Amino acid sequence: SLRIAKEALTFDDVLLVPAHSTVLPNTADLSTQLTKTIRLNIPMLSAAMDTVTEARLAIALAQEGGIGFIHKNMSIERQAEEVRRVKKHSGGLRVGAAVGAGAGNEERVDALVAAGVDVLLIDSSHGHSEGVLQRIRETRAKYPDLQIIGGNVATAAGARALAEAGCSAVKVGIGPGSICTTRIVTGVGVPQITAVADAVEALEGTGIPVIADGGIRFSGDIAKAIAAGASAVMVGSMLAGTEESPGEIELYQGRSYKSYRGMGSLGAMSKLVPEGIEGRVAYKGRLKEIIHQQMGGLRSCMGLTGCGTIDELRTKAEFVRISGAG
Amino acid sequence: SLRIAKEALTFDDVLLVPAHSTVLPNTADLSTQLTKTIRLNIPMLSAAMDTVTEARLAIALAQEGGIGFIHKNMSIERQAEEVRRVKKHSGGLRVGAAVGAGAGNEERVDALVAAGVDVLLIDSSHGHSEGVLQRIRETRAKYPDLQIIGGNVATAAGARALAEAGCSAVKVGIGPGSICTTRIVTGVGVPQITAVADAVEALEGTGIPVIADGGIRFSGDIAKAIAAGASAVMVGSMLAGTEESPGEIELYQGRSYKSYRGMGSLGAMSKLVPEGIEGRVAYKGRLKEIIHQQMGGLRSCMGLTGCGTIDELRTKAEFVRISGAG
Amino acid sequence: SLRIAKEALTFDDVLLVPAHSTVLPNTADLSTQLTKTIRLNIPMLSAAMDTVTEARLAIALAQEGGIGFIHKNMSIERQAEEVRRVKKHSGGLRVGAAVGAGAGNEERVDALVAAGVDVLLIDSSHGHSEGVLQRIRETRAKYPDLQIIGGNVATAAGARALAEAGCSAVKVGIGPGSICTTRIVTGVGVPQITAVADAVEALEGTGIPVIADGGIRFSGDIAKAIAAGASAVMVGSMLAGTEESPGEIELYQGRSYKSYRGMGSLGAMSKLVPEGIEGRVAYKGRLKEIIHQQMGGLRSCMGLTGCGTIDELRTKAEFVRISGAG
Amino acid sequence: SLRIAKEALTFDDVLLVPAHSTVLPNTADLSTQLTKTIRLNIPMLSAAMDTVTEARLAIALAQEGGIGFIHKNMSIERQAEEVRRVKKHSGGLRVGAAVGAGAGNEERVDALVAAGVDVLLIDSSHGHSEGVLQRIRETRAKYPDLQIIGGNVATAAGARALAEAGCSAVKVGIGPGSICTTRIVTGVGVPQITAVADAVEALEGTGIPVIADGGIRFSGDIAKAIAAGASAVMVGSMLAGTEESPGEIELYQGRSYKSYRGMGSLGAMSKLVPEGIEGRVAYKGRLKEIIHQQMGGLRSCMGLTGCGTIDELRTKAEFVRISGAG
Ligand SMILES: C[C@H](Nc1ccc2ncc3c(c2c1)CCOC3)C(=O)Nc1ccc(Cl)nc1
Ligand SMILES: C[C@H](Nc1ccc2ncc3c(c2c1)CCOC3)C(=O)Nc1ccc(Cl)nc1
Ligand SMILES: C[C@H](Nc1ccc2ncc3c(c2c1)CCOC3)C(=O)Nc1ccc(Cl)nc1
Ligand SMILES: C[C@H](Nc1ccc2ncc3c(c2c1)CCOC3)C(=O)Nc1ccc(Cl)nc1
Ligand SMILES: O=c1[nH]cnc2c1ncn2[C@@H]1O[C@H](COP(=O)(O)O)[C@@H](O)[C@H]1O
Ligand SMILES: O=c1[nH]cnc2c1ncn2[C@@H]1O[C@H](COP(=O)(O)O)[C@@H](O)[C@H]1O
Ligand SMILES: O=c1[nH]cnc2c1ncn2[C@@H]1O[C@H](COP(=O)(O)O)[C@@H](O)[C@H]1O
Ligand SMILES: O=c1[nH]cnc2c1ncn2[C@@H]1O[C@H](COP(=O)(O)O)[C@@H](O)[C@H]1O
């Protein structure tokens, strides 16, 4: 008999249900606990990607109430410098930085803690790997107060493994990324709505938040990820092509573009077979207007669902399952 | 566990079942109770939109046996004048007018009642909001005999809330509109067939009719909405581009067009993020031929289902659920 | 609660299961009982349409082992002449002719019986209509030995109604036609695989065969309709554009075409709203090669399923349900 | 009632679940038992097709750790020569050869055994046919030690029939081929994921491996077929257009192509109606790079699922069912 664990749902499979409301979109509270000690003003994390987050983007997002994650596709010294630029800014801004879950990263982590990183991201393509769990147990034992986000997982067992290893927050997402080809290359993936709810259910009562990472295309996807139980979302494509993102603006035929590629793409990699594509994204302009539009969508959802806080959206809002016709 | 209330169906998910019939399409009775006191000759209401209903369209539809709803995107004096033009016509024509569910609308409602409005439409994007319920309770207490339609809702709880608040009829539709982007922007919506049946079930035995508002593309959709339990349907796109609708006819490249936009579009709005698009619809001609074609479709359905009246269609006709292949 | 009688399946929703076989495709017996007295060599009936069957096509199909149905879109005298041409041919060929189920058709039926019609087709768009049932009871009482096919129905109740009224065979199909718009216009229809199995189950033990009429696109659809329980299939589009079909061959831009339209199209009609489209079909050539190809497909199915006769295919062959991905 | 045996799933209907892993993709063991006596280094078999496998391709694939199957669309002497070329190469390479399951093939089989064939492929379009079963029982009685692969089947009953007839391995696949039209022509087919799991369940405890033949488009499909229980996969389109495949390279408009057609196509056939198409595939280059890419995908899956061997992937890895939206 075919070993089918369950049916799994993606963003497009569901819709949120309107409910009794005393919530006006302008009155909605978007603050969220990224960890027990770290509270963000908006539930937005920028992707730890070489075409998405460096100090400039991390500064703009922190100013909006979110948090950026400096990618690991650079030298230890460059990364420590990027973190220092964000920490020494003005309005006491928070920053995160990504590290590989393999051997020979103890030095990179040391430099990042010295530079004043608020949250270390152990950036793995498979968080349920034993090597990853051991490295986070080792980072936790060395730095007992350091806020650590571990990922990625897409199951209840994977979420429990990261929480037991010492993670302050667990990142969910195996295969949902806009630039991901893991589903086609390996045949592995878990539809994000189910992946998030499974991870959140596993971590209930622990106070360990879940980050929904990947596949957010519209502000409606943010709302769905949060009502599935995520405390925050991580976005790549949504912030790619913004003025603040790294890389130069290109001109194809009148229209402005920026590069956007998976960290598992042939380009980002230069041994594993690629699990990401290399693409051009239309220039989005200033990050501030993107955040205002996306958070506005979330605000209107909160009004329609009668959830005045991120915690209410996470625990009260209901879904309906829809067909391909829906 | 993911909080999935139920699976929800849209027009395309179902088909009506042919049954024993003594009904000829030409013998079918299309009359319906919009409220306990108001009976329409056809189950058609025109959308309270600035690109759909003003006095001219409200006059043509009333003549066909339906009812128009003058939009709120104008001055109190202009709206009172539009209603007066319809009431003082010839064959004792009925009219409705839309009002916002916010504060500072008591004056607009006063002018509309004075002008002779037959039915006041409390036009909300979220009828289950406390503010809306309170304003309709206040309008009901001030005007105890005034026919009031309240909306929009898409749940059993929402329908009961509007009926208890004093509504003479309840309007259903959260996200089904042809020009709606609420599903993408907020992630909120309820597939219309389920939304209608849920609202009708909640109001059974109260004599409060349900209006199916939004997503009607074909005459088959009208039949489906009515068999789901709606007493009448409200149409926007179906009447957009008619000669009687407001705005001027445009010429793009040989072909004639009219503007059609959501009331939550950037244009109609000029603070909330837009929940509607701005578009061009092909010129449809005289409203009379559109009504004849659409009601003819409904008539043939009544013949195929053996339902001689709107009430029989609402309570006897059965559906089959179909797949994406169907 | 939404009145959903059941889920209903179409051809594309299912696949036939390969089984143990001693059947070679060349050894397969395609003969079938159209009625208790009439046996066809192939399970093919041509559609009673003005762009499909007249004496020439009825002659070619009868020669292949099937039966044609002369359409009613002509004078009583022309129709009687068409039937005479087929009956007085060479190898003792069988013919059918279509009549409307309304009043003022007694005369048309009289002329057709005189001309030597083997099977009268009471051609209704809604066979479950009381008027239709009464007219077939009247034809049965007048002509007790005349083979009568009544249709169309798409339910168990509809099949029983036609069988009780006196039908020698029942025709199934409400909305499946390639040129049908009833599903969009009226919202009524039943996916054909379910419609056929329901009608066959209702008629079990009566010896009244079921004809699957409409939506056959490929030879695989013929096999599916028969395994659903149909004794034969009726085809319109599959035979449209053949040399033998009525009308002239048109030249658009190098390529040859023939007209194909629904009997409920604006053209065929020239009062009801249209339920059919008017189109051009590519010229198919001689009917003989079409039949050889389509019956060859059926033969290979019989080999794969191990069903040596039409009766075995109807009662032994199994299906699997597939998804949109399948 | 419609005779629906069950719902059946294809590759696109499912995804593999990530699990706890101590497996690095580079450490994964790809070896598999094609039969009790034959062990391959990679789970890849090339299709016995005239546009896919001849001695050159069979040599390249064997060198990669797989096995080729020389097609039967040639003379007995040519086929015996092709097998001799592979057997007499260098690093003791294994080869297979295809034979028809009809009468007058005893001579072809005799020549192939003499030439040193390691595995005889009884290549039938319907393995559950009595003729096929009898011919393999006869080959088994004549050659008691000869490794025989019999196919194709897509049911538990079909797998048991081939195993009881003497097959050393059973090949699964009715209708999944990229170039197959059997589903459209005959209406017969079984979605491959279900077909494989059903055949594997039927053969549990017998030590008779199952080959998943047809529809493999991506390396993710290989992983899915193996986790469904297949010990190996057979590929046609994946190896078509490689330098090693038969036929000449064509130039259409700057781009290089090779022919790829079904063995049931009009061309390969030159009596049955065609069940295959004739097409052009883009030139893929050297087989070595294709294998490296595809096996790399499989390796990454093994890392993500924590399955270090083909046997672990076959018996431990779990799936989730996904929607059309997934
Ligand atoms: C080549 C591939 N590159 C990346 C890079 C960044 C990623 N970031 C997030 C995610 C994925 C990513 C894949 C894939 C799964 O979904 C989330 C990768 O590392 N493959 C991989 C497979 C199996 C194992 Cl044991 N180890 C590694
Ligand atoms: C911007 C948006 N504009 C409109 C205007 C007309 C509408 N008319 C009907 C419907 C919708 C409409 C949206 C949306 C839901 O489906 C039916 C709107 O008002 N958003 C909104 C969201 C949450 C809350 Cl608490 N308050 C208001
Ligand atoms: C206009 C329409 N014209 C046709 C003509 C031929 C047909 N032939 C087969 C079928 C249909 C056909 C419709 C429609 C249903 O599916 C099978 C028709 O007569 N409508 C109709 C509707 C309700 C009632 Cl009481 N009476 C008649
Ligand atoms: C014409 C057709 N030609 C082929 C050739 C190679 C194939 N190879 C694999 C498969 C199929 C193939 C069909 C079809 C089923 O799926 C797998 C074929 O032989 N039809 C057929 C049908 C019924 C019976 Cl009793 N005998 C034979
Ligand atoms: O090459 C890759 N393959 C798979 N996932 C990737 C790759 N690069 C980044 N990701 C993931 O995709 C996310 C971005 O998803 P997006 O917001 O849908 O574009 C990142 O935060 C990572 O979790
Ligand atoms: O901007 C908008 N967003 C969402 N719904 C809207 C908007 N404007 C109007 N509507 C709804 O859409 C209906 C028209 O739907 P239609 O008939 O499908 O075009 C109206 O009667 C309103 O209920
Ligand atoms: O205008 C029409 N509307 C609906 N059904 C029609 C019409 N004309 C013919 N039909 C049906 O469609 C069948 C032909 O279906 P086809 O083989 O899919 O083209 C006929 O035999 C009739 O039952
Ligand atoms: O004409 C044909 N019809 C149906 N199946 C075929 C035909 N020729 C080959 N096959 C099957 O299709 C497989 C190739 O599938 P692919 O890898 O998806 O291209 C072969 O190994 C055969 O089992």
Author numbering:
A (entry chain A), B (entry chain A), C (entry chain A), D (entry chain A): 1 to 89, 215 to 395, 411 to 466
Cite, word for word, the article reporting this structure.
GuaB catalyzes the oxidation of the substrate inosine-5´-monophosphate (IMP) to xanthosine 5´-monophosphate (XMP) using NAD+ as a cofactor, and guanosine 5´-monophosphate (GMP) synthase converts XMP to guanosine 5'- monophosphate (GMP) to generate guanine nucleotides essential for cell growth and viability. Indeed, genetic studies have shown that de novo guanine biosynthesis is essential for growth and viability of bacteria both in vitro and in vivo (10–23). Here, we present the first high resolution co-crystal structures of A. baumannii, S. aureus, and E. coli GuaB proteins (cystathionine beta-synthase (CBS) domains deleted), each determined with a matched set of three different inhibitors bound. Similarly, the NAD+ binding region, also where our compounds bind, occurs at the junction between neighboring molecules with side chains from both protomers contributing to ligand binding interactions.
The novel S. aureus and E. coli structures crystallize with one molecule in the asymmetric unit (asu), yet re-create the common GuaB tetramer arrangement via the fourfold symmetry operator of their I4 space group. We observed a tight overlay of structures across the bacterial strains, highlighting common critical interactions required for potency. These inhibitors mimic the NADH/IMP cofactor interactions by forming strong π-π stacking interactions with IMP while also hydrogen bonding with the conserved glycine (Gly299Ab/302Sa/300Ec) which is one of the two hydrogen bond interactions observed with the NADH amide. The ligand linker segment induces a 90° bend, directing either the amide N-H of G2 and G1 or the imidazole of G8 to form an important hydrogen bond to the conserved glutamic acid (Glu416Ab/417Sa/415Ec) while directing the aryl tail group into a hydrophobic shelf region. Differences in the polarity of a particular key selectivity residue specifically (Ser250 in E. coli versus Ala252 in S. aureus and Ala249 in A. baumannii) was found to be critical for inhibitor interaction with GuaB which corroborates the observations of previous reports. The key residues (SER-440 and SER-250) in the binding site of GuaB E. coli contribute to a stable and extensive water network (more green and well-connected spheres) predicted by WaterMap analysis with the pseudo-apo crystal structures. To disrupt such water network, the compound needs to pay a larger desolvation penalty leading to poor potency, whereas the same compound binding to GuaB in S. aureus and A. baumannii does not need to pay for such penalty with a less favorable water network (more red and less connected spheres). Based on our analysis of the water networks present in these structures, we hypothesize that differences in the free energy of solvation of the binding site produce the observed difference in binding activity.
